[PDB]
Amino acid sequence: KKARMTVDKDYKIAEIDKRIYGSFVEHLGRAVYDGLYQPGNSKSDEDGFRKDVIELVKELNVPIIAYPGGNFVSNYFWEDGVGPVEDRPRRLDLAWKSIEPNQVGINEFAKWCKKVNAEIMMAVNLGTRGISDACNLLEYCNHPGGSKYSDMRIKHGVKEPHNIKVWCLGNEMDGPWQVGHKTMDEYGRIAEETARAMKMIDPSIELVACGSSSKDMPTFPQWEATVLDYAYDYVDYISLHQYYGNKENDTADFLAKSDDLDDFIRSVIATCDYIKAKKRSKKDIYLSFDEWNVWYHSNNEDANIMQNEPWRIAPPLLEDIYTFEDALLVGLMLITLMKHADRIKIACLAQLINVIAPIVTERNGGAAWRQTIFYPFMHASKYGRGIVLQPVINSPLHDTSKHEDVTDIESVAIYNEEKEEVTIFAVNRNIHEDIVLVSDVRGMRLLEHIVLEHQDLKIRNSVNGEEVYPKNSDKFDDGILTSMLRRASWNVIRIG
Amino acid sequence: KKARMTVDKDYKIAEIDKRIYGSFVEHLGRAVYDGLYQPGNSKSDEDGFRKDVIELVKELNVPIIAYPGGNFVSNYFWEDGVGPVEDRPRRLDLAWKSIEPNQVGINEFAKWCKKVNAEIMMAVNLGTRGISDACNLLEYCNHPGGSKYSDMRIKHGVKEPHNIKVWCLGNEMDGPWQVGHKTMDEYGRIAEETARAMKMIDPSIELVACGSSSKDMPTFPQWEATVLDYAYDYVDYISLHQYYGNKENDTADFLAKSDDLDDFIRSVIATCDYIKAKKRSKKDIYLSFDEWNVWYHSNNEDANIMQNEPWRIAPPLLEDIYTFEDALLVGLMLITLMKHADRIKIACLAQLINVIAPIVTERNGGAAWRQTIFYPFMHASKYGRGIVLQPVINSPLHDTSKHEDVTDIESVAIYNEEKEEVTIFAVNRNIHEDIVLVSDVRGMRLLEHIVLEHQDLKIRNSVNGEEVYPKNSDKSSFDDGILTSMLRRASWNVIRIG
Amino acid sequence: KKARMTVDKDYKIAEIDKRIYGSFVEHLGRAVYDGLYQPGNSKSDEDGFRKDVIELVKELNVPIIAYPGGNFVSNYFWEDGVGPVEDRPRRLDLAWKSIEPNQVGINEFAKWCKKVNAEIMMAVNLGTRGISDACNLLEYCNHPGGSKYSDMRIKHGVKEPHNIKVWCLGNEMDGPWQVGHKTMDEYGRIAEETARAMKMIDPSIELVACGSSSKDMPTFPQWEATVLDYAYDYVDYISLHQYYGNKENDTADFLAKSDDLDDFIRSVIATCDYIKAKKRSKKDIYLSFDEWNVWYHSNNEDANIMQNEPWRIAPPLLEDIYTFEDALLVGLMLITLMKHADRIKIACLAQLINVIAPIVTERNGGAAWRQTIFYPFMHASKYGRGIVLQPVINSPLHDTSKHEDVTDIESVAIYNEEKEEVTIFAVNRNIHEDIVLVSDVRGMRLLEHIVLEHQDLKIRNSVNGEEVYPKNSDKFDDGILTSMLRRASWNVIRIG
């Protein structure tokens, strides 16, 4: 019935890097074509960009977007997507059994990214390509002019270099489904050598080495150790990927999965510091969580599409329609990312448009709308800039089918000194009981209580209406904040 | 004197996969240039192909043909053999120290294969190239259209895809002679990854991983075990390569070497069976014997030309001239191949034209004639479709100088249900003593007893007419259920039933 | 005070191979641009080559020049430096943080080598490139005509192939500063396979496998043992690099570092002989000492240029101005090389022009002059062709700050049977006392005694004139030669 946590600006975890509110666009399904890019459409500007989609993206305040993959990158040749569009080829995309027309490449996406106030985090091909191709691409993007590839950029219409800050050394080459799959030694060596080379061209960039595809890989976490062992001195991040599903329809146990996310993260941190010791390095590797989401709804329609319909352009792949319970887990995951903001400095909601996304457009030019998961993300990114405090919290527990001793309440406070606000992100994953949260704020006035609630866990949004949306509802006296947390609710409580 | 074996239609081994009667053209010596392809000559059609040669290949009923190598492929760049011929470059072929003009390539050789009723089994360059190059070549050949490398094929004269069904992941890279030689681990990994990628482009293809260059390689059979442990889930075949020679001038020993062939095959099957258990797989790896033949005659002259006359176009390399004893071993090898039809599904006589070949054209315009070895391969290919039946044979035995307990008679029956025939292939490796074969056939009339005999083991053929050729002879005779055939000492025998 | 040494033509070491008087030119600094190559300068020919430079090179009688690297080659694309000069790209050089314009490449350098009476020793990129690309270049250079790359060379304006005799299999890839850094196994495999392929195009070439970058690399000499274990049957040499410096300002210790060189050579020989036994080969590997010099003076200045001032064309890197003590050590090194002429068959003074060089041109059209180190090399190269005689020598010893039992006199005799002369090379590493050399010659008239001496060990040369030049000074009888060797001096004593 009652949950208690104390909140104190003295007891810090770290400052939030806004890059943990990043996302990701891959050349996959309708992410780009019949998605962000629809040339002759009434809602499309000059570049063919859906204006209504741009607006929705600015709503989430996404500062950084991974691109262009994803499995797609492991067999992509970046030259195919630049220069005169007339001379760009159509390629088989082996990852997703599609045809890539390459009408959107590095320059097109680059300008899309300005329009939504983001910048690229670039992936390079290390599956079928290597060191020299990574160098060409880096030079093309970051070198100012008067060398072969910088002049090639300039000639292609882009006078100023994109100056891309963060680059990813390939993509998840641990899996048997990946083109150019590598062993940990193989990938370790190619990543170390690519990183060494790229740093000679531009010392100011940052580099992400690939972690395991998931914690469930037999090579997790030795992959990470081995890869960091080779590449430590030349790279700045290790990558982490996690996705969750409710195919077993067990909402209580589903909502408990952020606890495993916490465990996953710690394991990866521990693996980092192990190698840190090994190298007697003073540098900390930070975590890049460059693929996280809920993902299960559309697995079967994806199966029908390959084969039976291979080599289509822009097939409707990975189009999960999200529920209310899904949006709760997303909220729980953001909360977990925040509690680890000392080590996690980049995270990417996978993905941004149509493909497991919080922003859908209909098909053949449809209207565009917010999925359920759009909202806990919007709150996180908007009120979540500042300083994370340690969640000292005693809260009721419960068991689920496959998880023991799971907290009913999961919460984090983040303090914004420059605004004199303290936002409490809180989720009641007790699916049945309501709970009152008593918050001894060793402060330092209440500003609002924003809530995401619904009686139907399986309810969805659609092109027709929103159902799940932030309601400014509810319900603080001395320096004690007391707030009722509805069973199965996402809460965002502010102070002034 | 007495040979007893017993046919039985109910006692089967396997259905013959017609791809055990495949062959192989490498861009080597006179195989293509001044061989199957002579653009000026009077016997050559509108494309430039010797039609006499085309007619001879058809005689052999060769369903499948390896191309373009062989050692040649390890440093080949396929793009050089396609597009406008005026814009194709000439290349050093390191394999054979020769200049490759590339006037024949892929699209040209795929036309040739249509005309001989054959398909291409394509090798890819894995010596100095890798995954993405294998990917482009597959897309160019097998993808219908609407993408860079398919649209490219179309632009080059070929509207429909070749849809090539079997691919070889590189060529024999364990050897210190091979350009881009790999260790078993390097090859295993490149083979696994190349196969993984290709199957994403076209799931209908089948793939062959390279075995050892020979059973005599010190890394055999660990090579095979290792390469399969890597690529098991993405490949369908492992290769075997075997050649024999009679430099010792011992004929009875020479014909006995098909026992060594049997052992080689069983070893590879045991190796596959072991990895299968290791992987707990329900799949059996099958055997592609994509290089076999007798080879030895031209060894001296072959070295002479490299390197004392290097970088010629189409030098006369590997032009073994075949004798009659060679033809018996080739016949025995085919029998051994057939006997293992339950695991060997592809096999290639190496090679088809000029180069250790059954077919020859002379030089600078040729003439075209059949070598001794042409004939057993012809019979095998023609009457050897259907079901191999289990050979229960009690044969007299005989030692030789380097082998023990070698059967005098080596025999196999193949039953075609669609014709209600039952062909019986037998070789009498008893070089001295004629022997009769008592065939108790639980059938089931007699149709013929084609034979291959000559009194001179060292006798050859030439452009000036045969010498060794099939004679519709014997001395056969079939009563109720029993066939009793006299098998002349040192003979090949094709005995049919109606 | 007393030093003796016996000299017996029956007691030989080896015939000297002129290729130990080789040198090296890298696309580094002003070595080429504003060095050997200066297009429309009054001192240059039609082709753009500085004629006075050309003459100075000839004075050193250099039979062989390594080209074009050096760290530079490891990310060099040879096709960039050939064909129509208007169509050659400008490339980033990652090794030296410079822009390489590629006006000079292969064909231009092949004809400069003619004018200086020298053959090229060609290095191939084995950093970002591999087997096929090394084949192409060899075909381009050595195959007469009738193939893609041979014909290409003919089209570019060179009808007869350069027919390059020696090739280096990459450069220094054992070091973390090199683009395309390889492990000893990675490199062993790649050198082996590249060697195998190249020898199929041209069996008459010789190949050098890369040894360790220096004897202080943690992987020396295991790198040598390993690489040779792979590539023995296809290569002819193992490379050695060594460079000495005097930042300690310890002129006596510094002059003893030719003893660490001697020890370095011996270890590389032992390693070769080890693998030889392992292979049961009847072939010996020879040593190619393709980088040796003094190098330390310009270290701080080099750092200042890269970075905070990078991507310049022809920046003034590695421009050491050599002292007199510096000249003494070169002579010491030469003598040490000479003592090992039975296994060392190629050595390259690094480098020829401007870059840690004996030959300098001023800057922007400059002037051209000789450094101190020019002369010991010049003498060694001129009077050093013949047959090396075992140094049977009893010399006073001295200890130094870091070297015990250093010889006071280092010396060798070489006997040119054709000219009926016997040259003795000698250094007095004892910078204080003047020693006398009683040279028993089981001969067999004294021709001259050349000397290189100076009162100030730190004196330099400069464009304004030479403070250090050979003086025909000094100071024989029965068959016993006696000469006084001034403290801290280079001596060339001759006989007819």
XYZ file of N, CA and C in Angstrom, chain C residues 280-454:
525
model
N 65.000 -26.878 -42.051
C 65.955 -27.787 -42.707
C 66.224 -27.323 -44.133
N 66.276 -26.009 -44.285
C 66.605 -25.396 -45.543
C 68.115 -25.270 -45.682
N 68.584 -25.322 -46.926
C 69.988 -25.061 -47.235
C 70.228 -23.562 -47.510
N 69.148 -22.779 -47.558
C 69.218 -21.336 -47.808
C 69.388 -20.484 -46.535
N 70.258 -19.476 -46.606
C 70.357 -18.449 -45.571
C 69.488 -17.254 -45.959
N 68.911 -16.596 -44.957
C 68.239 -15.334 -45.169
C 69.296 -14.255 -45.004
N 69.264 -13.237 -45.847
C 70.175 -12.129 -45.624
C 69.451 -10.970 -44.952
N 70.216 -10.081 -44.348
C 69.654 -8.951 -43.636
C 69.652 -7.733 -44.556
N 68.549 -7.006 -44.518
C 68.401 -5.785 -45.269
C 68.181 -4.690 -44.249
N 69.240 -3.968 -43.933
C 69.149 -2.971 -42.882
C 68.550 -1.691 -43.434
N 67.269 -1.719 -43.788
C 66.744 -0.695 -44.686
C 66.276 0.587 -44.007
N 66.709 0.776 -42.770
C 66.553 2.046 -42.060
C 67.593 2.141 -40.954
N 68.545 3.052 -41.128
C 69.500 3.351 -40.075
C 69.995 4.774 -40.209
N 70.157 5.420 -39.063
C 70.696 6.768 -38.972
C 70.822 7.234 -37.525
N 71.219 8.497 -37.362
C 71.011 9.224 -36.126
C 69.744 10.041 -36.336
N 68.889 10.099 -35.319
C 67.621 10.823 -35.412
C 67.129 11.198 -34.021
N 67.127 12.499 -33.714
C 66.611 13.007 -32.427
C 66.412 14.530 -32.354
N 67.189 15.274 -33.144
C 67.254 16.732 -33.035
C 65.922 17.463 -33.215
N 65.122 17.023 -34.176
C 63.929 17.772 -34.540
C 62.653 17.211 -33.927
N 62.800 16.371 -32.902
C 61.635 15.712 -32.313
C 60.537 16.674 -31.845
N 60.885 17.609 -30.963
C 59.911 18.580 -30.472
C 59.237 19.393 -31.578
N 60.007 19.839 -32.562
C 59.425 20.621 -33.651
C 58.398 19.825 -34.468
N 58.694 18.551 -34.715
C 57.794 17.677 -35.463
C 56.407 17.595 -34.822
N 56.389 17.405 -33.506
C 55.146 17.344 -32.739
C 54.290 18.590 -32.965
N 54.933 19.753 -32.958
C 54.219 21.014 -33.101
C 53.491 21.136 -34.433
N 53.993 20.460 -35.458
C 53.355 20.537 -36.769
C 52.114 19.633 -36.891
N 52.165 18.462 -36.262
C 51.053 17.506 -36.267
C 50.699 17.099 -34.828
N 49.591 17.599 -34.277
C 48.639 18.425 -34.999
C 48.762 19.913 -34.683
N 47.615 20.550 -34.456
C 47.471 22.021 -34.478
C 48.075 22.794 -35.686
N 48.597 22.065 -36.676
C 48.923 22.632 -37.994
C 49.053 21.583 -39.125
N 48.062 20.674 -39.255
C 48.198 19.495 -40.120
C 47.670 19.697 -41.534
N 47.791 18.655 -42.357
C 47.316 18.675 -43.736
C 47.943 19.787 -44.578
N 49.236 20.009 -44.364
C 50.020 20.893 -45.208
C 50.671 20.041 -46.291
N 51.047 20.669 -47.400
C 51.867 19.990 -48.379
C 53.322 20.233 -48.016
N 54.119 19.178 -48.077
C 55.554 19.278 -47.849
C 55.936 20.144 -46.654
N 55.478 19.775 -45.449
C 55.942 20.483 -44.251
C 57.352 20.024 -43.887
N 58.117 20.881 -43.198
C 59.509 20.605 -42.811
C 59.692 19.616 -41.650
N 59.301 18.362 -41.849
C 59.406 17.354 -40.798
C 60.781 16.699 -40.748
N 61.148 16.210 -39.567
C 62.320 15.359 -39.392
C 63.608 16.017 -39.854
N 63.618 17.338 -39.850
C 64.777 18.055 -40.345
C 65.863 18.241 -39.295
N 66.532 17.144 -38.958
C 67.687 17.201 -38.072
C 68.873 17.912 -38.730
N 69.544 18.778 -37.972
C 70.826 19.344 -38.402
C 71.939 18.662 -37.623
N 72.735 17.857 -38.316
C 73.662 16.957 -37.640
C 74.968 17.571 -37.165
N 75.399 17.112 -35.996
C 76.600 17.598 -35.347
C 77.790 16.770 -35.788
N 78.940 16.990 -35.163
C 80.139 16.229 -35.503
C 80.135 14.878 -34.796
N 79.742 14.861 -33.524
C 79.586 13.598 -32.806
C 78.615 12.686 -33.570
N 77.550 13.289 -34.104
C 76.578 12.579 -34.926
C 77.258 11.919 -36.109
N 78.222 12.611 -36.704
C 78.982 12.049 -37.815
C 79.845 10.867 -37.373
N 80.352 10.923 -36.148
C 81.233 9.869 -35.661
C 80.471 8.560 -35.519
N 79.223 8.667 -35.074
C 78.395 7.492 -34.849
C 77.967 6.843 -36.162
N 77.670 7.662 -37.166
C 77.395 7.145 -38.494
C 78.579 6.305 -38.954
N 79.779 6.837 -38.778
C 80.970 6.114 -39.168
C 81.104 4.826 -38.384
N 80.818 4.919 -37.096
C 80.811 3.738 -36.252
C 79.815 2.701 -36.781
N 78.616 3.162 -37.139
C 77.563 2.287 -37.650
C 77.966 1.634 -38.968
N 78.524 2.443 -39.865
C 79.062 1.949 -41.124
C 80.042 0.809 -40.881
N 81.031 1.061 -40.030
C 82.037 0.064 -39.695
C 81.383 -1.184 -39.128
N 80.368 -0.986 -38.292
C 79.634 -2.112 -37.745
C 78.908 -2.869 -38.860
N 78.263 -2.136 -39.764
C 77.593 -2.778 -40.891
C 78.604 -3.618 -41.645
N 79.720 -2.988 -41.998
C 80.806 -3.612 -42.753
C 81.309 -4.917 -42.121
N 81.473 -4.925 -40.799
C 81.857 -6.138 -40.065
C 80.900 -7.308 -40.280
N 79.683 -7.004 -40.720
C 78.663 -8.017 -40.902
C 78.227 -8.163 -42.362
N 79.142 -7.880 -43.279
C 78.817 -7.862 -44.700
C 78.553 -9.255 -45.273
N 78.740 -10.282 -44.445
C 78.450 -11.651 -44.874
C 76.969 -11.996 -44.752
N 76.259 -11.288 -43.889
C 74.832 -11.500 -43.757
C 74.025 -10.254 -44.138
N 74.616 -9.077 -43.953
C 73.980 -7.835 -44.357
C 74.389 -7.512 -45.780
N 73.436 -7.586 -46.702
C 73.710 -7.403 -48.121
C 73.003 -6.161 -48.661
N 72.089 -5.601 -47.870
C 71.458 -4.325 -48.198
C 71.301 -3.463 -46.954
N 71.710 -2.202 -47.035
C 71.410 -1.264 -45.961
C 71.025 0.072 -46.570
N 70.128 0.793 -45.905
C 69.707 2.101 -46.392
C 69.845 3.172 -45.329
N 70.700 4.155 -45.596
C 70.762 5.335 -44.745
C 69.424 6.041 -44.888
N 68.759 6.274 -43.772
C 67.459 6.906 -43.819
C 67.604 8.309 -43.264
N 67.339 9.339 -44.068
C 66.935 9.196 -45.463
C 67.901 9.988 -46.350
N 67.616 10.040 -47.648
C 68.490 10.681 -48.626
C 68.449 12.213 -48.618
N 67.260 12.782 -48.765
C 67.113 14.215 -49.011
C 66.225 14.886 -47.981
N 66.774 15.905 -47.310
C 66.055 16.732 -46.327
C 65.643 16.043 -45.015
N 65.029 14.873 -45.145
C 64.465 14.140 -44.025
C 65.550 13.278 -43.377
N 65.903 13.620 -42.135
C 67.069 13.048 -41.439
C 68.195 12.653 -42.409
N 68.685 13.642 -43.151
C 69.443 13.384 -44.376
C 70.868 13.941 -44.374
N 71.728 13.406 -45.240
C 73.058 14.008 -45.377
C 73.048 15.156 -46.397
N 71.938 15.295 -47.109
C 71.800 16.279 -48.168
C 70.549 17.121 -47.898
N 70.722 18.434 -47.847
C 69.659 19.359 -47.453
C 69.475 20.439 -48.515
N 68.239 20.882 -48.736
C 67.973 22.081 -49.527
C 67.180 23.057 -48.655
N 67.421 24.358 -48.802
C 67.050 25.300 -47.738
C 65.577 25.433 -47.332
N 64.710 25.747 -48.291
C 63.258 25.933 -48.079
C 62.799 26.883 -49.163
N 61.807 26.478 -49.940
C 61.271 27.325 -51.003
C 62.325 27.688 -52.031
N 62.947 26.682 -52.631
C 63.860 26.932 -53.730
C 65.295 26.925 -53.262
N 65.469 27.103 -51.950
C 66.693 26.812 -51.218
C 68.048 26.898 -51.894
N 68.977 26.040 -51.492
C 70.345 26.225 -51.954
C 71.156 24.944 -52.110
N 70.998 24.025 -51.156
C 71.661 22.708 -51.162
C 73.086 22.647 -50.606
N 73.275 21.773 -49.623
C 74.546 21.630 -48.952
C 74.706 20.286 -48.250
N 75.902 20.051 -47.713
C 76.260 18.780 -47.114
C 76.206 18.851 -45.596
N 75.644 17.821 -44.968
C 75.629 17.740 -43.515
C 76.889 17.031 -43.076
N 77.149 16.997 -41.771
C 78.379 16.369 -41.302
C 78.404 14.914 -41.716
N 77.269 14.244 -41.534
C 77.144 12.806 -41.801
C 77.318 12.403 -43.267
N 77.293 13.375 -44.175
C 77.524 13.122 -45.595
C 78.860 12.394 -45.833
N 79.899 12.842 -45.139
C 81.259 12.417 -45.448
C 81.653 11.005 -45.034
N 81.315 10.594 -43.795
C 81.701 9.218 -43.463
C 81.025 8.253 -44.426
N 79.771 8.532 -44.750
C 79.070 7.699 -45.703
C 79.801 7.712 -47.035
N 80.180 8.903 -47.502
C 80.843 9.046 -48.800
C 82.129 8.228 -48.888
N 82.912 8.251 -47.814
C 84.149 7.488 -47.785
C 83.861 5.992 -47.802
N 82.981 5.564 -46.903
C 82.610 4.159 -46.814
C 82.145 3.640 -48.176
N 81.320 4.425 -48.857
C 80.753 4.005 -50.131
C 81.804 3.929 -51.246
N 82.770 4.842 -51.204
C 83.814 4.911 -52.230
C 84.950 3.913 -51.991
N 85.525 3.929 -50.794
C 86.691 3.103 -50.510
C 86.305 1.779 -49.861
N 85.004 1.508 -49.808
C 84.499 0.324 -49.134
C 84.068 -0.863 -49.979
N 84.210 -0.785 -51.299
C 83.940 -1.942 -52.154
C 85.150 -2.872 -52.155
N 84.932 -4.155 -51.888
C 86.010 -5.126 -51.885
C 85.724 -6.355 -51.039
N 86.613 -6.642 -50.086
C 86.509 -7.839 -49.259
C 86.863 -7.544 -47.811
N 85.938 -7.842 -46.911
C 86.108 -7.538 -45.499
C 87.014 -8.546 -44.784
N 88.002 -8.034 -44.049
C 88.981 -8.857 -43.343
C 88.733 -8.828 -41.845
N 88.714 -9.996 -41.210
C 88.404 -10.079 -39.783
C 89.171 -9.083 -38.916
N 88.433 -8.347 -38.086
C 89.059 -7.394 -37.171
C 89.768 -8.122 -36.036
N 90.986 -8.582 -36.290
C 91.829 -9.090 -35.219
C 92.440 -7.876 -34.548
N 91.893 -7.475 -33.410
C 92.307 -6.218 -32.822
C 92.308 -6.252 -31.308
N 93.409 -5.793 -30.725
C 93.451 -5.536 -29.296
C 93.457 -4.026 -29.029
N 92.358 -3.536 -28.461
C 92.170 -2.106 -28.229
C 91.909 -1.802 -26.761
N 92.450 -0.672 -26.275
C 92.154 -0.221 -24.912
C 90.643 -0.106 -24.712
N 90.168 -0.382 -23.504
C 88.750 -0.272 -23.224
C 88.471 0.893 -22.302
N 87.222 1.336 -22.321
C 86.742 2.344 -21.400
C 85.296 2.019 -21.095
N 84.848 2.340 -19.894
C 83.439 2.183 -19.587
C 82.786 3.547 -19.758
N 81.470 3.567 -19.901
C 80.750 4.822 -20.005
C 79.596 4.767 -19.031
N 78.689 5.723 -19.140
C 77.595 5.816 -18.193
C 76.693 4.587 -18.215
N 76.553 3.975 -19.389
C 75.618 2.864 -19.569
C 76.193 1.692 -20.365
N 77.440 1.810 -20.806
C 78.086 0.729 -21.543
C 79.426 0.385 -20.923
N 79.585 -0.863 -20.501
C 80.879 -1.307 -20.011
C 81.793 -1.719 -21.168
N 83.098 -1.701 -20.915
C 84.085 -2.288 -21.819
C 83.958 -1.926 -23.305
N 83.548 -0.693 -23.587
C 83.518 -0.174 -24.952
C 84.928 -0.078 -25.527
N 85.106 -0.499 -26.776
C 86.404 -0.373 -27.419
C 86.727 1.102 -27.605
N 88.006 1.455 -27.495
C 88.453 2.813 -27.784
C 88.495 2.984 -29.291
N 88.999 1.958 -29.967
C 89.071 1.981 -31.417
C 88.152 0.930 -32.020
N 87.328 1.372 -32.961
C 86.547 0.478 -33.794
C 87.146 0.610 -35.191
N 87.370 -0.518 -35.856
C 88.084 -0.498 -37.123
C 87.875 -1.756 -37.980
N 87.902 -1.578 -39.298
C 87.870 -2.690 -40.247
C 88.769 -2.418 -41.439
N 89.296 -3.484 -42.029
C 90.031 -3.349 -43.276
C 89.251 -4.001 -44.404
N 89.153 -3.325 -45.546
C 88.616 -3.987 -46.729
C 89.601 -3.963 -47.903
N 89.708 -5.107 -48.572
C 90.720 -5.344 -49.593
C 90.129 -5.464 -50.992
N 90.250 -4.397 -51.778
C 89.826 -4.423 -53.175
C 90.914 -4.994 -54.095
N 90.916 -6.319 -54.251
C 91.914 -7.039 -55.051
C 92.144 -6.453 -56.444
N 91.104 -5.877 -57.035
C 91.217 -5.308 -58.375
C 92.112 -4.067 -58.411
N 91.930 -3.178 -57.437
C 92.681 -1.927 -57.378
C 94.005 -2.088 -56.624
N 94.191 -3.266 -56.029
C 95.395 -3.602 -55.264
C 95.600 -2.626 -54.108
N 94.478 -2.253 -53.497
C 94.458 -1.376 -52.338
C 93.894 -2.099 -51.106
N 94.051 -1.481 -49.940
C 93.482 -1.992 -48.700
C 93.091 -0.787 -47.871
N 91.795 -0.521 -47.755
C 91.361 0.642 -46.998
C 91.061 0.234 -45.569
N 91.497 1.057 -44.620
C 91.152 0.860 -43.223
C 90.262 1.996 -42.758
N 89.152 1.633 -42.128
C 88.231 2.595 -41.561
C 88.399 2.513 -40.060
N 88.474 3.661 -39.390
C 88.720 3.663 -37.955
C 88.172 4.892 -37.239
N 87.619 4.670 -36.055
C 87.073 5.747 -35.248
C 87.709 5.716 -33.868
N 87.988 6.894 -33.327
C 88.479 6.981 -31.972
C 87.358 7.420 -31.028
N 86.587 6.451 -30.538
C 85.458 6.726 -29.648
C 85.928 7.247 -28.300
N 87.238 7.193 -28.075
C 87.820 7.810 -26.894
C 88.017 9.284 -27.207
N 87.134 10.100 -26.647
C 87.042 11.496 -27.031
C 88.108 12.352 -26.355
N 88.898 11.732 -25.484
C 89.896 12.453 -24.700
C 91.340 12.170 -25.122
N 91.746 10.906 -25.060
C 93.118 10.542 -25.402
C 93.265 10.228 -26.884
N 94.454 10.487 -27.414
C 94.770 10.161 -28.798
C 95.530 8.842 -28.850
N 95.024 7.893 -29.633
C 95.546 6.527 -29.627
C 96.330 6.200 -30.895
N 97.314 5.315 -30.768
C 98.132 4.917 -31.911
C 97.814 3.496 -32.398
N 97.788 3.334 -33.716
C 97.340 2.093 -34.326
C 98.477 1.352 -35.016
N 98.976 0.316 -34.355
C 100.030 -0.514 -34.924
C 99.383 -1.642 -35.720
N 99.308 -1.467 -37.036
C 98.580 -2.395 -37.900
C 99.487 -3.395 -38.635
N 99.682 -4.578 -38.055
C 100.454 -5.632 -38.721
C 99.745 -6.060 -40.010
N 100.379 -5.815 -41.149
C 99.830 -6.263 -42.422
C 100.642 -7.414 -43.015
N 100.090 -8.629 -42.972
C 100.702 -9.777 -43.648
C 100.511 -9.634 -45.159
N 100.963 -8.501 -45.687
C 100.706 -8.126 -47.060
C 101.617 -8.826 -48.044
N 102.310 -8.098 -48.930
C 102.287 -6.628 -49.080
C 102.854 -5.815 -47.912
N 102.896 0.003 -49.459
C 103.050 1.404 -49.851
C 101.844 2.275 -49.457
N 102.073 3.273 -48.593
C 101.013 4.169 -48.073
C 100.547 5.248 -49.061
N 99.239 5.309 -49.315
C 98.693 6.216 -50.331
C 98.293 7.582 -49.780
N 97.525 7.563 -48.693
C 97.058 8.773 -48.023
C 96.292 8.378 -46.779
N 96.063 9.354 -45.917
C 95.310 9.134 -44.699
C 94.330 10.289 -44.641
N 93.066 10.008 -44.948
C 92.031 11.031 -44.882
C 91.495 11.093 -43.467
N 91.106 12.283 -43.034
C 90.621 12.442 -41.677
C 89.393 13.344 -41.628
N 88.535 13.076 -40.654
C 87.389 13.925 -40.387
C 87.411 14.245 -38.901
N 87.875 15.441 -38.558
C 88.016 15.803 -37.154
C 87.574 17.227 -36.873
N 87.225 17.498 -35.620
C 86.882 18.857 -35.225
C 87.026 19.093 -33.720
